[PDB]
PDB file of C-alpha atoms and ligand atoms in Angstrom:
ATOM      1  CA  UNK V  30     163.796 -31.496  37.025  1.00  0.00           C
ATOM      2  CA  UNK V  31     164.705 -33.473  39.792  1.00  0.00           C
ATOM      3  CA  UNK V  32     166.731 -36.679  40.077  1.00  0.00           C
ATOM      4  CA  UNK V  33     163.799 -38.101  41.846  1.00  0.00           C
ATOM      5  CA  UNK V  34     161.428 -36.905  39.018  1.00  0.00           C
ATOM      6  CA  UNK V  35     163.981 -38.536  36.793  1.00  0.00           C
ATOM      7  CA  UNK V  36     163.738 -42.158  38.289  1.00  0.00           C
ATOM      8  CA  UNK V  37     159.761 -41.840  38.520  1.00  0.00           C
ATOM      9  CA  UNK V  38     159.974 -40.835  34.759  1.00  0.00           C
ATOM     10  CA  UNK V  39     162.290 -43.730  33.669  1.00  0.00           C
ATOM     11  CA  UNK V  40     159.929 -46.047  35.960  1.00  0.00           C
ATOM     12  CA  UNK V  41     157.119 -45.208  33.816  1.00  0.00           C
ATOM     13  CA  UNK V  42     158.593 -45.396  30.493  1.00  0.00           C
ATOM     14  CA  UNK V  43     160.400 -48.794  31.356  1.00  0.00           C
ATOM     15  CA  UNK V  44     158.648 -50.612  33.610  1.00  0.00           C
ATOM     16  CA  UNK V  45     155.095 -52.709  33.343  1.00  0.00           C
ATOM     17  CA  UNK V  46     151.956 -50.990  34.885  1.00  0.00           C
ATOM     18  CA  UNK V  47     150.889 -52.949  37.682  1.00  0.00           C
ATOM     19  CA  UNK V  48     153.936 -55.135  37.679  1.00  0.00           C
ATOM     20  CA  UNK V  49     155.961 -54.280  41.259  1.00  0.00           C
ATOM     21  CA  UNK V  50     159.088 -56.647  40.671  1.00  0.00           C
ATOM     22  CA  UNK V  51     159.610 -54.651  36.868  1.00  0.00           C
ATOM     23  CA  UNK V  52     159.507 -51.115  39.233  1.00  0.00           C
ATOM     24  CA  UNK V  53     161.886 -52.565  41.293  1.00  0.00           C
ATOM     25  CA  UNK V  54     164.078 -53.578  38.449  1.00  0.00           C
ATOM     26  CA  UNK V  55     164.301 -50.501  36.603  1.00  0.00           C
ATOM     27  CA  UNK V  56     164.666 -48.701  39.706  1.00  0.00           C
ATOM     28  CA  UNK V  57     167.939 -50.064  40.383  1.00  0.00           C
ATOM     29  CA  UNK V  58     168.859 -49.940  36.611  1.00  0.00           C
ATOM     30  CA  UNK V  59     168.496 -46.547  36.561  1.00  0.00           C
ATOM     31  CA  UNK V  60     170.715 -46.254  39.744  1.00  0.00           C
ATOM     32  CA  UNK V  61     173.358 -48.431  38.580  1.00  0.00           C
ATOM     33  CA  UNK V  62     174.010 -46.758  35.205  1.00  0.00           C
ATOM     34  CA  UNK V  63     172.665 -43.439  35.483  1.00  0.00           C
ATOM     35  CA  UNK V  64     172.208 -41.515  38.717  1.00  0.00           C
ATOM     36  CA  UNK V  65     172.954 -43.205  42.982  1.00  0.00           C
ATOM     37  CA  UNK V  66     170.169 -42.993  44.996  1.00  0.00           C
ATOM     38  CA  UNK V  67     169.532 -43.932  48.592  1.00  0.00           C
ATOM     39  CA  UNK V  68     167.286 -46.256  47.840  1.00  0.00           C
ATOM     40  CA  UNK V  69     167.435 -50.017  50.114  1.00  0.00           C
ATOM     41  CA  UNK V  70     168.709 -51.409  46.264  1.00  0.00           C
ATOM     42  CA  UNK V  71     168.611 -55.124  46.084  1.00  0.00           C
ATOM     43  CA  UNK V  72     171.871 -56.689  48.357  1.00  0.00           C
ATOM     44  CA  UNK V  73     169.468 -54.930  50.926  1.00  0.00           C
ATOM     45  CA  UNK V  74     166.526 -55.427  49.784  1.00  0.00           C
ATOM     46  CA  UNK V  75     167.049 -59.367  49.110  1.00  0.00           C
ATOM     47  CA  UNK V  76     167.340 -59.480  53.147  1.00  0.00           C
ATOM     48  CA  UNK V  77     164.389 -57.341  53.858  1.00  0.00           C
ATOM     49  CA  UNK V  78     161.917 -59.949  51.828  1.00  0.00           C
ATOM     50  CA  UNK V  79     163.128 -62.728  53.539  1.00  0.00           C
ATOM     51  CA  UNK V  80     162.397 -60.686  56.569  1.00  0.00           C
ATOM     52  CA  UNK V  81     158.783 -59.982  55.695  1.00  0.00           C
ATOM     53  CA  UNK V  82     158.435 -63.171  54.526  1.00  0.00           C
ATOM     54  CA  UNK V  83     159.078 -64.597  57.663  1.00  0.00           C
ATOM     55  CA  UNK V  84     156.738 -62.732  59.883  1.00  0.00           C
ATOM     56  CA  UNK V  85     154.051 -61.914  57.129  1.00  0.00           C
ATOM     57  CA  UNK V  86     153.056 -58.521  59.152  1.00  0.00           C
ATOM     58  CA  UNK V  87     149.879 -57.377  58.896  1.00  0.00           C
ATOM     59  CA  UNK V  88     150.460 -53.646  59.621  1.00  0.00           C
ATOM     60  CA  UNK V  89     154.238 -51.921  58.476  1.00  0.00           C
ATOM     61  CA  UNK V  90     155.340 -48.464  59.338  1.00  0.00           C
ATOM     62  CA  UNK V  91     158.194 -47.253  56.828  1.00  0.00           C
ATOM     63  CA  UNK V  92     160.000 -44.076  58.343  1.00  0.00           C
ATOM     64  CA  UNK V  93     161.509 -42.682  55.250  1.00  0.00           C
ATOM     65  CA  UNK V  94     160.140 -43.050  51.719  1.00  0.00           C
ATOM     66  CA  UNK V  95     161.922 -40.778  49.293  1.00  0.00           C
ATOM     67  CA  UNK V  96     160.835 -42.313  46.194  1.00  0.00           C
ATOM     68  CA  UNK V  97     158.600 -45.723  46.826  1.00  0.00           C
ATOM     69  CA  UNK V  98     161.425 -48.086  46.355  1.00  0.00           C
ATOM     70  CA  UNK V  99     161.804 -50.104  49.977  1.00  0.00           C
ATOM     71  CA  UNK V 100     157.254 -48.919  50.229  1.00  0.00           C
ATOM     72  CA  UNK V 101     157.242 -51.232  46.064  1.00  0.00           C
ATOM     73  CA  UNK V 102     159.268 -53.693  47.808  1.00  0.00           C
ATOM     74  CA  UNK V 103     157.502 -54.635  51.223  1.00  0.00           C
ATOM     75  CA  UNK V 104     153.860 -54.072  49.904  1.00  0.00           C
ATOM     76  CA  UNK V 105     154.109 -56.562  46.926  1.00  0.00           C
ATOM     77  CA  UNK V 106     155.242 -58.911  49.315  1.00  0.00           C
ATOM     78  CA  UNK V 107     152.321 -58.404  51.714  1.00  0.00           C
ATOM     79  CA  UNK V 108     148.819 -59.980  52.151  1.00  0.00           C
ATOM     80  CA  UNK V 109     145.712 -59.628  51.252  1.00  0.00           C
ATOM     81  CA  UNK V 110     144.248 -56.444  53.021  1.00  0.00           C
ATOM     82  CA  UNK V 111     147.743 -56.212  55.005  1.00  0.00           C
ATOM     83  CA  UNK V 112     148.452 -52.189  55.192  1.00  0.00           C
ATOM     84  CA  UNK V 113     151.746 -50.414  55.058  1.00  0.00           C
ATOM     85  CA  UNK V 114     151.600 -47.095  56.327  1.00  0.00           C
ATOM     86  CA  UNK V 115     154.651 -44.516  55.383  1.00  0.00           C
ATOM     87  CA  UNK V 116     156.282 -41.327  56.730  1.00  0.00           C
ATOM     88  CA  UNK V 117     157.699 -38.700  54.682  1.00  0.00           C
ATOM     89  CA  UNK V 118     158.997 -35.023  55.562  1.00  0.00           C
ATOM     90  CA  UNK V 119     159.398 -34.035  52.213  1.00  0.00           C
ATOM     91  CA  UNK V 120     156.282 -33.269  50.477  1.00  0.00           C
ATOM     92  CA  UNK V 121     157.697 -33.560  46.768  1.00  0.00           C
ATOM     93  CA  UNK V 122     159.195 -36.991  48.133  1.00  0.00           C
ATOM     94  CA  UNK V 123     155.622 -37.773  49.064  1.00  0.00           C
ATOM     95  CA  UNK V 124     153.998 -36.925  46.021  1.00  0.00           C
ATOM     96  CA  UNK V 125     156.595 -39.095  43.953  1.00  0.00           C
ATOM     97  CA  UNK V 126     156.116 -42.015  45.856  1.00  0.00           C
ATOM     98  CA  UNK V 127     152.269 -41.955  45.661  1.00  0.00           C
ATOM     99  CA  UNK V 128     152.593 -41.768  42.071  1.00  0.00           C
ATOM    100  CA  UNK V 129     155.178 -44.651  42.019  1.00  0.00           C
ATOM    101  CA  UNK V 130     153.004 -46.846  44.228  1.00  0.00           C
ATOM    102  CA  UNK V 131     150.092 -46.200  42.245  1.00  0.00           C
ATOM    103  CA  UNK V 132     151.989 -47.128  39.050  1.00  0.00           C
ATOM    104  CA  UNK V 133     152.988 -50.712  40.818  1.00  0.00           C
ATOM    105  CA  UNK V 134     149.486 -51.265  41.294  1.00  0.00           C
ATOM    106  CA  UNK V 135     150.183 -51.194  45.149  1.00  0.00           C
ATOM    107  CA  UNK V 136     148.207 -47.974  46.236  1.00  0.00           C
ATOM    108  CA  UNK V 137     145.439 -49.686  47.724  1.00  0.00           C
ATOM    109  CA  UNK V 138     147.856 -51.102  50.457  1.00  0.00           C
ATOM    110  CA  UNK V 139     149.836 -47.862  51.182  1.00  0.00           C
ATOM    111  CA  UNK V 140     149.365 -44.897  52.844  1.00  0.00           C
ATOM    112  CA  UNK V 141     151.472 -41.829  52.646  1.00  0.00           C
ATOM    113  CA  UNK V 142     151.958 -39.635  55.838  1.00  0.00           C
ATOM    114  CA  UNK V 143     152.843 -35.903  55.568  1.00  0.00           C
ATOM    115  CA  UNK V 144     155.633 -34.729  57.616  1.00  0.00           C
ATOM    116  CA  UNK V 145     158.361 -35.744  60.170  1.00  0.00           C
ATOM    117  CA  UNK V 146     158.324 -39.021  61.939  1.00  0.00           C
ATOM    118  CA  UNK V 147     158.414 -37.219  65.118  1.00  0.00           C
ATOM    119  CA  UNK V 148     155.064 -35.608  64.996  1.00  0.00           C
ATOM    120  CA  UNK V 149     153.040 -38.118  63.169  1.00  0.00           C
ATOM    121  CA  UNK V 150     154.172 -40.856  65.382  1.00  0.00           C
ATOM    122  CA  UNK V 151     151.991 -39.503  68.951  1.00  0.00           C
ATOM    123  CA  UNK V 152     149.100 -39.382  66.368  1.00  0.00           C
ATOM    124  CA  UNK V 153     149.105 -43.173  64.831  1.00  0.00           C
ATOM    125  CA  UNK V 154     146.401 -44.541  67.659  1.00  0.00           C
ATOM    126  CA  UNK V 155     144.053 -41.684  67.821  1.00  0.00           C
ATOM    127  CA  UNK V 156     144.124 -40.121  64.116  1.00  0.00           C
ATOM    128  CA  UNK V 157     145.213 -43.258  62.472  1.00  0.00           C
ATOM    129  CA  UNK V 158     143.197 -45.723  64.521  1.00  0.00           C
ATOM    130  CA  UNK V 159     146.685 -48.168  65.278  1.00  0.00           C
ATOM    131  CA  UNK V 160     146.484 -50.415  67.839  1.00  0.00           C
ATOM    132  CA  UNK V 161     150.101 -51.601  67.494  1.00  0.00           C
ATOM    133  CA  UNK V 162     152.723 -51.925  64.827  1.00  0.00           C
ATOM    134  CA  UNK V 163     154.152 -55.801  63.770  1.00  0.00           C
ATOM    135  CA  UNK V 164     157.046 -54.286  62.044  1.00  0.00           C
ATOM    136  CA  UNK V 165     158.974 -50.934  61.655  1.00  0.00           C
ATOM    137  CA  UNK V 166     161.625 -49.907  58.725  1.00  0.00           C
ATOM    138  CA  UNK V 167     163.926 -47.513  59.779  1.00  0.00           C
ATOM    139  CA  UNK V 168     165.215 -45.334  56.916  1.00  0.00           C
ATOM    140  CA  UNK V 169     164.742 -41.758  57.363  1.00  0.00           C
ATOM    141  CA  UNK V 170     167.625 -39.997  59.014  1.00  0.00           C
ATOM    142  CA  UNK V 171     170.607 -41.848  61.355  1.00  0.00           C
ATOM    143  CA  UNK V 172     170.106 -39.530  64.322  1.00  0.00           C
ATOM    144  CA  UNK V 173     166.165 -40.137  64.389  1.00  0.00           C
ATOM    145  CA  UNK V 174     166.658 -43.603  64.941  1.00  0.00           C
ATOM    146  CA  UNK V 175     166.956 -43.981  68.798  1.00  0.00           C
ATOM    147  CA  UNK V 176     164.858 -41.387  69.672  1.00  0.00           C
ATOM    148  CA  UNK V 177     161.586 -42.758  67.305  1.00  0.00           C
ATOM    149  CA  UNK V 178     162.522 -45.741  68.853  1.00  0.00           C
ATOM    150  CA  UNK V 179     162.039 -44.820  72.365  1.00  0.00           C
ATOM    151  CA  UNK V 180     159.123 -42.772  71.329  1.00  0.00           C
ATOM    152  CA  UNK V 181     157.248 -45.247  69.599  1.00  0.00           C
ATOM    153  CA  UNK V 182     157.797 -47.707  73.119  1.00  0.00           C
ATOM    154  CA  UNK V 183     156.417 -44.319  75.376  1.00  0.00           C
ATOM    155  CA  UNK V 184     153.486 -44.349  72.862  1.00  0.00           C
ATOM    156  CA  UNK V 185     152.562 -48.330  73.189  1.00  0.00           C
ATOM    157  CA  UNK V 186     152.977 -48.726  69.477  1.00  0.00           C
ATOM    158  CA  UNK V 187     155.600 -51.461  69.841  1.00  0.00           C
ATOM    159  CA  UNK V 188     153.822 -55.067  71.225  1.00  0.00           C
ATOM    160  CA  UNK V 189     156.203 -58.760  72.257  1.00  0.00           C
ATOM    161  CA  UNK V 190     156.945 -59.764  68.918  1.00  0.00           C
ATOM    162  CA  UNK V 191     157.017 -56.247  66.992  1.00  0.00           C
ATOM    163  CA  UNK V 192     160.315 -56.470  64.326  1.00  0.00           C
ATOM    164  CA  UNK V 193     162.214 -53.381  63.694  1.00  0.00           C
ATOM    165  CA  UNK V 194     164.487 -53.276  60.465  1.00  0.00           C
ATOM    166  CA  UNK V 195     166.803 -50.531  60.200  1.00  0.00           C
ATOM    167  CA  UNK V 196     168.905 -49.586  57.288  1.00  0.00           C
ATOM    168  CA  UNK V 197     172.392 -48.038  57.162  1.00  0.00           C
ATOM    169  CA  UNK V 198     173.822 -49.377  60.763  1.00  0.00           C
ATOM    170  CA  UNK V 199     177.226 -49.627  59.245  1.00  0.00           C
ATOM    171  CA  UNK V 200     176.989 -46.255  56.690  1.00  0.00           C
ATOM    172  CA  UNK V 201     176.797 -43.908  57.787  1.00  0.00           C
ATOM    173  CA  UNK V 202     176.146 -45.546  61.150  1.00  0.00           C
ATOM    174  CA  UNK V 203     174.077 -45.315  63.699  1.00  0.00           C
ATOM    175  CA  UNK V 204     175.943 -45.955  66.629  1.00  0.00           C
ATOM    176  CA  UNK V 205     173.788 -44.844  69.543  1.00  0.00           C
ATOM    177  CA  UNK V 206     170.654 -46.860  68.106  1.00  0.00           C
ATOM    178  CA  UNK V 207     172.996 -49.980  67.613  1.00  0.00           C
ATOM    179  CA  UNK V 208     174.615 -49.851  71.439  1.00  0.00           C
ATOM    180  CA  UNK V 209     171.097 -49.128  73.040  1.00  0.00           C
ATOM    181  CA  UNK V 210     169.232 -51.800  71.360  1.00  0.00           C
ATOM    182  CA  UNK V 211     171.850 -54.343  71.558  1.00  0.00           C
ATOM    183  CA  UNK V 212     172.401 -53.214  75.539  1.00  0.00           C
ATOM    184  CA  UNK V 213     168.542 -53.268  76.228  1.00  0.00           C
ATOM    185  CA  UNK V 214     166.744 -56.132  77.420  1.00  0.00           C
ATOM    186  CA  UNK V 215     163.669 -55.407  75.548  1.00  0.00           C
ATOM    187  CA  UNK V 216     165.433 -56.556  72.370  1.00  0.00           C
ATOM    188  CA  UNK V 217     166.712 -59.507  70.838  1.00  0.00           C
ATOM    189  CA  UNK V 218     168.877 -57.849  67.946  1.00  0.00           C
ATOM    190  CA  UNK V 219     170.449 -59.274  64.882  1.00  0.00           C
ATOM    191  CA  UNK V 220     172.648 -57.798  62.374  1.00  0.00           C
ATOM    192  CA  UNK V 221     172.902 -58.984  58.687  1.00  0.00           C
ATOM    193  CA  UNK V 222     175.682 -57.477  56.958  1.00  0.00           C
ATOM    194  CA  UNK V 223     175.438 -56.591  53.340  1.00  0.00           C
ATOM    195  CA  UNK V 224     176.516 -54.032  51.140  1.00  0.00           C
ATOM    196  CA  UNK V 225     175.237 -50.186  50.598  1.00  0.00           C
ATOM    197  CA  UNK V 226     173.058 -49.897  47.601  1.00  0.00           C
ATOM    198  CA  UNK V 227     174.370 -50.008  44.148  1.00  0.00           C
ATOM    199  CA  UNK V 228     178.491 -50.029  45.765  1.00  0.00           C
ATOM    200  CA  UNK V 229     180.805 -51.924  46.184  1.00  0.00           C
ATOM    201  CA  UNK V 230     180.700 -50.501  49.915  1.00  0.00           C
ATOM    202  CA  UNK V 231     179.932 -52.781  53.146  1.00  0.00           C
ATOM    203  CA  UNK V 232     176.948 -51.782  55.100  1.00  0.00           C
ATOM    204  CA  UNK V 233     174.203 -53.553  57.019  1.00  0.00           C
ATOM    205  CA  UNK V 234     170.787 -53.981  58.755  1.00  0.00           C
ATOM    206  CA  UNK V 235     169.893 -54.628  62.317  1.00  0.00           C
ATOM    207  CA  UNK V 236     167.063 -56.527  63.460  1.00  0.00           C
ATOM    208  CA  UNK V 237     166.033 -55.896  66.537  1.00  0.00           C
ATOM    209  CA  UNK V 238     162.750 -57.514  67.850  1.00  0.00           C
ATOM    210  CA  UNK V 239     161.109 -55.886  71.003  1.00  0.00           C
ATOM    211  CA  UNK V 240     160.243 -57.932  73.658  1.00  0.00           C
ATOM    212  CA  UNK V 241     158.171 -56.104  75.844  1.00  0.00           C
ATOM    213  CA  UNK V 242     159.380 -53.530  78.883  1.00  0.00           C
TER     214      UNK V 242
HETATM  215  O1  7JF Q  13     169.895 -40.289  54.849  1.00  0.00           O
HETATM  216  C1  7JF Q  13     169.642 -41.411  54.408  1.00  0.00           C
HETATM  217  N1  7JF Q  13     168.431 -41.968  54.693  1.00  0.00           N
HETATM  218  C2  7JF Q  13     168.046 -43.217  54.363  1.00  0.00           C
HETATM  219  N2  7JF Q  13     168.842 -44.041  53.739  1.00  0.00           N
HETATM  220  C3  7JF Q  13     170.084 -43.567  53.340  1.00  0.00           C
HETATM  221  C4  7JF Q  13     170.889 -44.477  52.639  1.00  0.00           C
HETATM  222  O2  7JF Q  13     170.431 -45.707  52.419  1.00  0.00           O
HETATM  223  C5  7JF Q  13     172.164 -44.030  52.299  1.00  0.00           C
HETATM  224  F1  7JF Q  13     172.919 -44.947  51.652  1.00  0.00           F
HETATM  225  C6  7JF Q  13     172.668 -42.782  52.567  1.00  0.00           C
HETATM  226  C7  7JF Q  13     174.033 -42.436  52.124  1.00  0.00           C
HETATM  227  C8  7JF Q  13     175.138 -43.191  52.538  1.00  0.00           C
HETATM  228  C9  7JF Q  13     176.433 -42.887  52.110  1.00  0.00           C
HETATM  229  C10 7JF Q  13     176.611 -41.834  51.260  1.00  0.00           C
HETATM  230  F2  7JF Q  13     177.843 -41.530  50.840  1.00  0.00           F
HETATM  231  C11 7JF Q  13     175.523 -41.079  50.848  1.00  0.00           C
HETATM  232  C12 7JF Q  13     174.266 -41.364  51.280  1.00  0.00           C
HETATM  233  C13 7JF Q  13     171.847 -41.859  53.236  1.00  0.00           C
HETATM  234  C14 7JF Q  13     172.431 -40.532  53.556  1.00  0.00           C
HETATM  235  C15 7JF Q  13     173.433 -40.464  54.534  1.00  0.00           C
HETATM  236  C16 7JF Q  13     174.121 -39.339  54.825  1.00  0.00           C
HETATM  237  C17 7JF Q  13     173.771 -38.187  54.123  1.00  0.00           C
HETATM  238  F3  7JF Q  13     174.470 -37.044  54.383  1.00  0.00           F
HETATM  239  C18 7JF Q  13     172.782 -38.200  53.182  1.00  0.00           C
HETATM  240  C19 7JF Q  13     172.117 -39.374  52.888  1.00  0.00           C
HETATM  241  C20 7JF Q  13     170.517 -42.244  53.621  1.00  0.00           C
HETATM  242  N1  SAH Q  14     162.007 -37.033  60.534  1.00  0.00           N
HETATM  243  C1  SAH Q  14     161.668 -37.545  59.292  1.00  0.00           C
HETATM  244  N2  SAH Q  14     160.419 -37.995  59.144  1.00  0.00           N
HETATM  245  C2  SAH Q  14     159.994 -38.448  57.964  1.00  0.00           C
HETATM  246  N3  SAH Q  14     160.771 -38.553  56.820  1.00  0.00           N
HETATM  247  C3  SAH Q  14     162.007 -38.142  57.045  1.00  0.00           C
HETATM  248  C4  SAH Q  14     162.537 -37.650  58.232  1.00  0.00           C
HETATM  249  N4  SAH Q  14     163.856 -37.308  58.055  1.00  0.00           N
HETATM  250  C5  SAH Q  14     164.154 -37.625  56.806  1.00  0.00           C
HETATM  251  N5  SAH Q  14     163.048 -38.153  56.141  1.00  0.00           N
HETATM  252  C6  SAH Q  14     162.991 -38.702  54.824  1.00  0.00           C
HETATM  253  O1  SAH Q  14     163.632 -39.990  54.829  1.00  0.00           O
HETATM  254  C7  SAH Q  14     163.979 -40.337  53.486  1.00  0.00           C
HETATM  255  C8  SAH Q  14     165.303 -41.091  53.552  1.00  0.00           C
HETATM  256  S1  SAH Q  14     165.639 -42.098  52.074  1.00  0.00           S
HETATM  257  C9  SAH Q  14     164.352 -43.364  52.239  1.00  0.00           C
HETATM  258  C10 SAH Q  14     164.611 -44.497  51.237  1.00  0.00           C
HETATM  259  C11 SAH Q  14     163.475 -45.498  51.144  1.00  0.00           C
HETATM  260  N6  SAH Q  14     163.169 -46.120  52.451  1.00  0.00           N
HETATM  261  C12 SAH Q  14     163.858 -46.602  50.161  1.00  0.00           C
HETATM  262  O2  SAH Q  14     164.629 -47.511  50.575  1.00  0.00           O
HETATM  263  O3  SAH Q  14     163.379 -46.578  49.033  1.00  0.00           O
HETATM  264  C13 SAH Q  14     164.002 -39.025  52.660  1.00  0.00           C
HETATM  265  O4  SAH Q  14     163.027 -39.026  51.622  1.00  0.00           O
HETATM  266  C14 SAH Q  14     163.748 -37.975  53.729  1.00  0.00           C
HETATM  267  O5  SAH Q  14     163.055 -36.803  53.248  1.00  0.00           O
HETATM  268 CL1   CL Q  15     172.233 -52.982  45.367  1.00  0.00          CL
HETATM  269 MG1   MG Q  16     168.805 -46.240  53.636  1.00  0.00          MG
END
């Protein structure tokens, strides 16, 4: 087995059925005192719900869901008949997170997308039936950052008001998605420094909130 079967595994024997906040919890046990994992963790993931709190988005697009963790964390916080939608390259990745979600109760809010970012992206309008996006978590890879940015923009996914979120500006950095948003006038960026999951590490997230081309 797999340290990512492991966490599902503990999930299930120690958390509530149905009960998102006790996944989250023994999540972040289990990474504390057994086993790091790049999940968002809770320093993070305390700023995230304020975030979604805030702007209550009805549609989400998660690049990056490795286990369900951050996917747990922004669809319990969602409303009624709001939709997340999720990327993932890795199918055994995928198939733990569906099961996670599904544990939380939360599957009817989710969907899971097979494969990279940078191929399911040009097919969110057409296949997916998008229109466009209110809020985007960055959290797949540090070097796909800039580019999905720019090609979500090309695709008119991104509308005046659409929030992205992206983890991990500090470590490991992600220095030429930092200096083009924060150089661009079609953001208004904000960083909110915090620490890296489950260390006693700084790190951060920038917001940065497009504002049209
Ligand atoms: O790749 C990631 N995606 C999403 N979130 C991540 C995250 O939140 C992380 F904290 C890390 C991280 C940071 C520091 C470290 F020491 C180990 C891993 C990674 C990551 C970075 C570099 C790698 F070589 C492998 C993994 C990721
Ligand atoms: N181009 C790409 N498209 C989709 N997923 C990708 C990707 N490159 C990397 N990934 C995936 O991004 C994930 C990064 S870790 C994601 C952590 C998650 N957001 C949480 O906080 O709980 C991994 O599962 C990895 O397989
Ligand atoms: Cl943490
Ligand atoms: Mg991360």
């Amino acid at each position: 087995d797999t340290k990512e079967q492991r966490i599902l595994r503990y999930v299930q024997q120690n958390a509530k059925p149905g009960d998102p906040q006790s996944v989250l919890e023994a999540i972040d046990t289990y990474c504390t005192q057994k086993e790091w994992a790049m999940n968002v963790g809770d320093a993070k993931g305390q700023i995230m719900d304020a975030v979604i709190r805030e702007y209550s988005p009805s549609l989400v697009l998660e690049l990056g869901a490795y286990c369900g963790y951050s996917a747990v964390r922004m669809a319990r916080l969602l409303q009624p008949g709001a939709r997340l939608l999720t990327m993932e390259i890795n199918p055994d990745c995928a198939a733990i997170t569906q099961q996670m979600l599904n544990f939380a109760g939360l599957q009817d809010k989710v969907t899971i997308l097979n494969g990279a970012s940078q191929d399911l992206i040009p097919q969110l309008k057409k296949k997916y039936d998008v229109d466009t996006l209110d809020m985007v978590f960055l959290d797949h890879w540090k070097d796909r950052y800039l580019p999905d940015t720019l090609l979500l923009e090309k695709c008119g996914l991104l509308r005046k008001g659409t929030v992205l979120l992206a983890d991990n500006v500090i470590v490991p950095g992600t220095p030429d998605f930092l200096a083009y948003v924060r150089g661009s006038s079609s953001f208004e960026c904000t960083h909110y420094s915090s620490y890296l999951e489950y260390m006693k590490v700084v790190d951060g997230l920038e917001k940065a909130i497009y504002q049209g081309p």
